Amino acid sequence: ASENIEVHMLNKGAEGAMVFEPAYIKANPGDTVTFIPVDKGHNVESIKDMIPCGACKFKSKINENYVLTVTQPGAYLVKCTPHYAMGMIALIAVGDSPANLDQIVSAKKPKIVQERLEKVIA
Ligand SMILES: *SCCNC(=O)CN(CCN(CCN(CC(=O)O)CC(=O)NCCS*)CC(=O)O)CC(=O)O
Ligand SMILES: [Y+2]
Ligand SMILES: [Zn+2]
């Protein structure tokens, strides 16, 4: 029962500047996640080592409609490349209790990104 989750890349949203909406993405394995450049200047990229072991890395083009197939269970931390240090990230939680979530929380990342991450988790 494969489902698509559409995510918008925005200069401004609910949580402030440079956001993915939603920035928590709840998915099942086999679902898809579509990133939409609603405003110009965004893309989506998996953060090095912040996808589940078994998952494959990716980096979309700026202003590209990009669809990701989330086969492997676990947590994905994605960033917009230019806006990463401004907090432009999304957490994709695939299946229950995503295994590498504590790992991603511990991993090295900008304070401002940590802030947004902990907020979405909470
Ligand atoms: S696109 C990234 C992911 N999937 C995948 O299976 C990638 N493969 C790379 C082959 N490599 C070694 C295979 N391997 C060793 C390992 O990583 O434990 C067996 C396995 O994928 N287990 C999964 C991850 S915790 C090199 C590598 O990327 O590590 C294809 C493959 O033959 O598995
Ligand atoms: Y592998
Ligand atoms: Zn951006």
Curated annotation (Swiss-Prot):
Up-regulation conditions: Under anaerobic growth conditions and by nitrite.
A single MF term (Gene Ontology): electron transfer activity
Entry keyword Lipoprotein: no
Keyword Electron transport (UniProt): yes
UniProt cofactor note: Binds 1 copper ion per subunit.
Protein's job: This soluble electron transfer copper protein is required for the inactivation of copper-containing nitrite reductase in the presence of oxygen. Serves as a direct electron donor to the nitrite reductase.
This protein's name: Pseudoazurin
Source taxonomy: Bacteria, Pseudomonadati, Pseudomonadota, Betaproteobacteria, Burkholderiales
Residues of the full protein shown: 24 to 143 of 146
